[PDB]
Structure 1
Amino acid sequence: GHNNTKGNRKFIKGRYTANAAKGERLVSSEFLLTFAGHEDISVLVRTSQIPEMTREDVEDYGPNGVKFNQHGPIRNSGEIQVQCVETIEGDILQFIKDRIAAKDYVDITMAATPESKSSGVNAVTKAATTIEMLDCKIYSDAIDFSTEDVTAAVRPSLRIVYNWIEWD
């Protein structure tokens, strides 16, 4: 067909080596999350997202129709929706009831610990893949159980206001 079609291999081959040598790829499934003082029960979480981190941009206009972008305050606060599971007696129900009774603040720790590097007796984390979250504002949401939900159990969703992110 086209005269400019033939290529070489060693280029993409060394490319492939570099790609396969960058480092092992981490699954999204692996995750650990712990509360402040209730890490015994925090294992029950199943779906969550890392807290969003970003800073806002001021979009200014100048002479000669010029556009410009400038720093602003850190967008440190926002909302995180997570998915978990309850127990026979409602560990999470009693926990949130006690939390709303006490009217207090909680601190959480999130980390990614691949089992390959795990050592000791319990999972050991590293400073690179761990984030501590402060001034967490925990609440739950109503969960709808349907009619045909024969094979589906309750999936408790929680809405969490987060204020500012710290990295260790």
Structure 2
Amino acid sequence: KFIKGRYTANAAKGERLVSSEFLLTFAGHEDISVLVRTSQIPEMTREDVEDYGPNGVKFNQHGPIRNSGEIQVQCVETIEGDILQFIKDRIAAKDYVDITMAATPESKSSGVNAVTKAATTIEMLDCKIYSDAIDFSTEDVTAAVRPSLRIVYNWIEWD
């Protein structure tokens, strides 16, 4: 066994993310983060402007950024009326909250690299939280009540 040379690779190699771990803070209401089960990342797109040149040629051009959009969140309810009281408070008083979405639970306090942590996180500012109808029925004893939340964000921040 003789070490003749060195190996170098020009491709991205890394373990694939699992979508089963994420976090959703809801600004100053941190105790709700446990009850969530489904979330999304915003659209991250831009408008397009269509033009027709001489003859039939056509060009698509970058447009202004899309700021506001809609996201869907699903959670579960506890006996103490947590989500119900949360939604009642949100409807009663107009307010805007900030939601932080992270693709990883939390970086271990080793802190080897912070860039790989800020790369996956995203923040929405000035958000509105509403709810949809909730289904109650017998004949399904093992089921659990699942409120469905509709969240409207107004700005997207990263890094």
TM band (smaller chain) = 0.7 to 0.9
CA distance in 1 between counterparts of 2:100 and 2:72 reads 16
Contact 1:113–1:124, Cα closer than 8 Å, also in 2: no
CA distance in 2 between counterparts of 1:84 and 1:140 reads 11
CA distance in 2 between counterparts of 1:122 and 1:41 reads 29
Contact 1:46–1:84, Cα closer than 8 Å, also in 2: yes
- Count of aligned pairs: 159
Q: Which structure shows the bigger proportion of residues in helix conformation?
A: 1
Q: Deviations over 1:20-67 (max 9, x none)?
A: 971011111111110111112222110111121110111211111111
Secondary structure of 1:24's partner? coil
Identity %: 100
Q: Which runs of 4+ in 1 moved over 6 A?
A: 10-21, 120-125
Contact 1:113–1:123, Cα closer than 8 Å, also in 2: no
Normalising by structure 2, report the TM-score: 0.83
Deviation at 1:148, TM superposition (A): 2.5
Contact 2:23–2:105, Cα closer than 8 Å, also in 1: no
Contact 1:111–1:125, Cα closer than 8 Å, also in 2: no
Contact 1:34–1:43, Cα closer than 8 Å, also in 2: no
CA distance in 1 between counterparts of 2:95 and 2:28 reads 13
Deviation at 1:19, TM superposition (A): 11
Contact 1:55–1:72, Cα closer than 8 Å, also in 2: yes
Seen in structure 2, the aligned counterparts of structure 1 residues 54 and 15 have a Cα distance that, compared at 3 Å, is farther
Deviation at 1:99, TM superposition (A): 1.6
Contact 1:81–1:157, Cα closer than 8 Å, also in 2: yes
CA distance in 2 between counterparts of 1:22 and 1:76 reads 33
Contact 1:35–1:108, Cα closer than 8 Å, also in 2: yes
CA distance in 2 between counterparts of 1:112 and 1:153 reads 26
Contact 1:26–1:114, Cα closer than 8 Å, also in 2: no
CA distance in 2 between counterparts of 1:75 and 1:11 reads 58
RMSD of equivalent CA atoms? 4.8
CA distance in 2 between counterparts of 1:113 and 1:86 reads 24
Deviation at 1:147, TM superposition (A): 3.4
Moved more, 119-128 or 104-113: 119-128
Gaps of 5+ in 1: 1-9
